[PDB]
Design an enzyme around this catalytic site. Structure first.
Site, mmCIF file in Angstrom:
data_model
loop_
_atom_site.group_PDB
_atom_site.id
_atom_site.type_symbol
_atom_site.label_atom_id
_atom_site.label_comp_id
_atom_site.label_asym_id
_atom_site.label_seq_id
_atom_site.Cartn_x
_atom_site.Cartn_y
_atom_site.Cartn_z
ATOM 1 C CE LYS A 81 -74.153 54.683 -29.040
ATOM 2 N NZ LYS A 81 -72.959 54.098 -28.396
ATOM 3 N N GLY B 26 -79.638 55.263 -18.620
ATOM 4 C CA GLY B 26 -81.005 55.676 -18.818
ATOM 5 C C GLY B 26 -81.214 57.085 -19.293
ATOM 6 C CG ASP C 182 -77.607 55.266 -27.005
ATOM 7 O OD1 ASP C 182 -76.965 55.417 -28.067
ATOM 8 O OD2 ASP C 182 -77.476 56.032 -26.026
HETATM 9 N N1 LIG Z 1 -75.319 42.858 -26.922
HETATM 10 C C1 LIG Z 1 -75.934 43.778 -26.185
HETATM 11 N N2 LIG Z 1 -77.278 43.711 -26.048
HETATM 12 C C2 LIG Z 1 -77.892 44.641 -25.310
HETATM 13 N N3 LIG Z 1 -77.373 45.671 -24.653
HETATM 14 C C3 LIG Z 1 -76.041 45.715 -24.806
HETATM 15 C C4 LIG Z 1 -75.269 44.832 -25.532
HETATM 16 N N4 LIG Z 1 -73.930 45.186 -25.459
HETATM 17 C C5 LIG Z 1 -73.917 46.251 -24.702
HETATM 18 N N5 LIG Z 1 -75.162 46.619 -24.264
HETATM 19 C C6 LIG Z 1 -75.471 47.759 -23.415
HETATM 20 O O1 LIG Z 1 -75.765 48.849 -24.247
HETATM 21 C C7 LIG Z 1 -75.529 50.066 -23.508
HETATM 22 C C8 LIG Z 1 -75.006 51.111 -24.455
HETATM 23 S S1 LIG Z 1 -74.786 52.757 -23.742
HETATM 24 C C9 LIG Z 1 -76.477 53.299 -23.431
HETATM 25 C C10 LIG Z 1 -76.479 54.786 -23.204
HETATM 26 C C11 LIG Z 1 -77.806 55.369 -22.721
HETATM 27 N N6 LIG Z 1 -78.549 55.993 -23.846
HETATM 28 C C12 LIG Z 1 -77.548 56.401 -21.615
HETATM 29 O O2 LIG Z 1 -78.401 56.524 -20.777
HETATM 30 O O3 LIG Z 1 -76.468 57.012 -21.626
HETATM 31 C C13 LIG Z 1 -74.568 49.700 -22.377
HETATM 32 O O4 LIG Z 1 -75.185 49.929 -21.121
HETATM 33 C C14 LIG Z 1 -74.279 48.210 -22.584
HETATM 34 O O5 LIG Z 1 -74.176 47.499 -21.369
#
Ligand SMILES: Nc1ncnc2c1ncn2[C@@H]1O[C@H](CSCC[C@H](N)C(=O)O)[C@@H](O)[C@H]1O
Lengths: 396, 390
Positions: free
Chosen positions: A247, A121, A209
């Site tokens: 991202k 988050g 992200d």
């Molecule tokens: N197919 C998918 N659909 C949705 N979310 C996904 C995904 N594959 C991975 N994720 C999720 O995407 C996230 C990316 S990292 C998110 C980072 C965030 N901005 C922070 O607070 O640091 C991970 O938690 C992962 O579980």
């Protein structure tokens, strides 16, 4: 030795993409010759990325490689400072990245955030921290989602705010409309966007992200479907005049290029960006659309959702209709990946070579340089103490 | 494409190593390595980084093929073997022929006339020496003995000269199959060599089994070394094929060499492919033989083999510096530039192979004409051809 102190501070890399006057046709065809430049970039960048393969062969050296790469993160110490000093929460590196994005992108409005693939988050919290201390928004309304697999929320932001999160727990598996957050699944993207527009009108800020975790030189190709469902979720939910932060990674695949070409019709401004706090050793990029110009037509929605549903590599558009734009994306590739990332990957190798067993001594040599970069970050991205009454509810 | 039109011939790379006056002490105990070994570790890590740069092309056989076409395109000596073969009646003109021939023409050996060529099949080294001895040295007759891990003998040089080969076919499992990683075979091979040939003025060894290429070959190259050192007569010369020279065992073995030759070199002939790490250690003028103990210690060292240095590396700072300079010149500078060059050729010509060959063809002829001028060749008379069964 010498090389260690001559390190130049990095810039927030922000490359504008030119606006595309012609209407959008989702149709591929004989690709434009510039695609060849991009493939040369991808071969080159994979070459330089491939240099850390020998180190990957044994878990001993792998560990030390990532220690070294963590040692050349010039911003890690800034996170503890920002938390301790300004009451920031969930100060991951993504918090830095989001806060830097919000300062330098000059968004028209960030008061209503949909943050997709957000699990810890940091983005939400940076947005929260920015909106109260800088934007002096009376209130901040947000929704988020992240992939909740039926098999992480390190700070309790999910469980302490169930109304704000749009995916469902494995306890709702077997529901016909079970939405586990997976944005590679077309119905999950519809549902997520439907759900967000419901808890939130208008949505001014979409952030996504997400990244598959795996092999290092197929990273863009492995994420095309995720990153495509990220984008779709945003383009189905973000309101006109809204803003988008997605991202991405290397941007060399035709599909990526075509998706940017798609983005080109929806925002008044569109940037490929690399915050300084986005680790220059990786390929991570953030695509930023400012001022959403219009929404999907019902036909555009159908086609793109069908693509996500039955996914493939092929260009979303005729890429030769966007020569100008690909030239600017290519500039972004050249600046972010062929210049910066390759230099900082080379620098990282030189750090590994000379310090792989002297980690303490490397962090001693870089500490003053780290402070210079964090100081300059603090100058560029003014911070202010966040009031207790405006913290996020955390369960951890 | 200026970076193609200013390509220039490589030079024979030759780095002298200092002979050690100090008495050789073969080590019984592991010891703390000298700090210069870290710089050799760094050279190994770096050289493997650049080598690794081709891994992505390796994964899919389609681009793998293109890569090997590209590396073929930049091999500046590609057609030289056959030109040498026809023009001068040369035999077994493999690349080993060119390398040994170039080696013979540069290193100014005192004598190349009583050859023991080990790990030698198909026989380019013997052939180059035969060719060089008869066209250039004019020894009355050239006597040689050879050995190789039992076949492959692609030119029938082994089948047709049973008198000359010191390993045995599997029908003699009773036995020396010419595997120089076996201490008894090494000692046996040397004995066999010194009985069938007296004296021995030239020992060569051409054996080789990418991050661990050197390390995978330590045993082989140790056996190679011991076979020569146990049979190379006083005043004699040695040519040992090596690779990267970064492992502490390798360096310690070079250290051993430095007690036995008046001159000692690391070399990269131009006809040794600049894109690989192959090196040739050359000792000139053997000053002394092993003492009995040195033989026992070294052979026992091969019998129960491990990484540990043969000597205290810290007593060879000077040599170790000259080796590093060799590694710097051959591996970190030349070989890395040529791998980089290949990768640059891959990126710009992976789909334009014929074009890159067109660009390089004129250069290929200047490089090959240069090698022929630097290593003068004369037609080998028929009565001096080796006898071949294939
Ligand atoms: N197919 C998918 N659909 C949705 N979310 C996904 C995904 N594959 C991975 N994720 C999720 O995407 C996230 C990316 S990292 C998110 C980072 C965030 N901005 C922070 O607070 O640091 C991970 O938690 C992962 O579980």
């Amino acid at each position: 030795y010498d090389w260690l102190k001559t390190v130049e501070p990095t810039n927030f890399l922000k490359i504008g993409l030119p606006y595309q006057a012609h209407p959008l046709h989702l149709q591929a065809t004989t690709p434009p010759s510039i695609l060849e430049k991009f493939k040369r970039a991808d071969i080159l960048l994979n070459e330089v990325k491939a240099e850390m393969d020998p180190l990957m062969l044994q878990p001993e050296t792998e560990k030390k490689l990532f220690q070294i790469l963590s040692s050349i993160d010039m911003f890690k110490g800034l996170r503890k400072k920002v938390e301790f000093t300004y009451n920031a929460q969930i100060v991951t590196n993504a918090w830095l990245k989001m806060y830097e994005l919000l300062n330098t992108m000059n968004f028209n409005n960030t008061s209503q955030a949909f943050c997709n693939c957000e699990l810890p988050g940091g983005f939400i919290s940076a947005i929260n921290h920015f909106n109260y201390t800088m934007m002096h928004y009376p209130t901040f309304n947000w929704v988020a989602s992240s992939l909740y697999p039926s098999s992480e929320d390190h700070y309790g932001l999910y469980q302490c705010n169930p109304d704000n999160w749009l995916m469902q727990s494995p306890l709702l598996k077997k529901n016909i409309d079970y939405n586990n957050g997976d944005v590679t699944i077309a119905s999950n993207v519809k549902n997520l966007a439907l759900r967000a527009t419901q808890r939130l009108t208008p949505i001014h800020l979409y952030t996504a992200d997400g990244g598959i975790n795996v092999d290092y030189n197929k990273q863009e190709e492995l994420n095309l479907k995720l990153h495509f469902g990220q984008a779709l979720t945003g383009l189905l939910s973000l309101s006109k005049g809204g803003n988008m932060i997605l991202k991405h990674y290397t941007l060399n695949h035709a599909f990526t290029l075509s998706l940017i070409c798609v983005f080109s019709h929806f925002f008044e401004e569109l940037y490929i960006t690399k915050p300084t706090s986005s680790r220059p050793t990786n390929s991570e990029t953030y695509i930023v659309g400012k001022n959403r110009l219009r929404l999907f037509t019902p036909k555009e929605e159908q086609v793109l959702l069908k693509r996500l549903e039955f996914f493939n590599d092929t260009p979303l558009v005729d890429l030769s209709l966007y020569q100008n734009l690909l030239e600017s994306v290519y500039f972004a590739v050249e600046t972010i990946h062929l210049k910066q990332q390759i230099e900082f990957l080379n620098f990282g190798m030189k750090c590994y070579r000379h310090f792989y067993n002297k980690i303490k001594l490397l962090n001693d040599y870089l500490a003053p340089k780290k402070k210079i970069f964090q100081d300059r970050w603090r100058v560029l991205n003014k911070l202010y103490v966040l009031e207790k009454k405006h913290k996020l509810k955390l369960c951890a």
